[PDB]
């Protein structure tokens, strides 16, 4: 009926697509869950817009729209850089922290998902099978 | 044990890898190859650069510049529509044909070999199971 050529990548467009939706249910985009992440990750001594921007590869105005979205949320925060105060420095809220700590249910959800559809004998012979597919191609 | 996710992250990106190396023979990119083989199924229908880009969801210049190179190597060529001369249709040469169908071959043997890995009851369960997931993800 299919090949496995088409199968593989059916599910992993299919995978990126479900992921993106469960992501919007937070109404958050990829682009936002990008930058939510960077400052998780990135925030400790201060990041600037500029920063954020070079860091993302994207342009200063996606930036800016990007984190007024955010903050109009109260996701991200901003506080003046006391030694450079041209500058403000942007943060990540208790509540953005809680958020992107909340995203690692999506993967979770989209595993036991699919996991539900076999039994675990069938899901163990998926598995080393898979497995086996896998080597072939390494 | 590894995650569905994992397993099948990790298969699309072998799977491309060794597709990558197997189109080396052939001196050409995945671009390059979707091109041509779009070409090869739709030609009749007279498809011009515009056509290409709206199929292969590339951009404009992107396309313009993949075609001058197949047409540098005689792949394929242009001639202009009677009936609308304000498009240029792109046809196949002989040797753009003989090129498809050989980097077909070599793809068949790809997916050939991969189902070698498995006997015919786990490939019948594997396709099964997969169709069974890929429905799931919608």
Redesign the interface.
Known sequence: ?????Y??????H??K??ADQKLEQFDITNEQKHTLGYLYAHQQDGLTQNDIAKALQRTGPTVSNLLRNLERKKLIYRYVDAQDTRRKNIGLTTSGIKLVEAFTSI?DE??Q???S??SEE?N????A??????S???
């Open positions: 009926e299919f090949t496995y050529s199968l593989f990548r059916m599910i992993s299919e995978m697509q479900k993967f989209m595993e998902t699919l996991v559809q076999l069938e163990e012979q998926m598995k099978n898979l497995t086996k597919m896998l072939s191609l390494q």
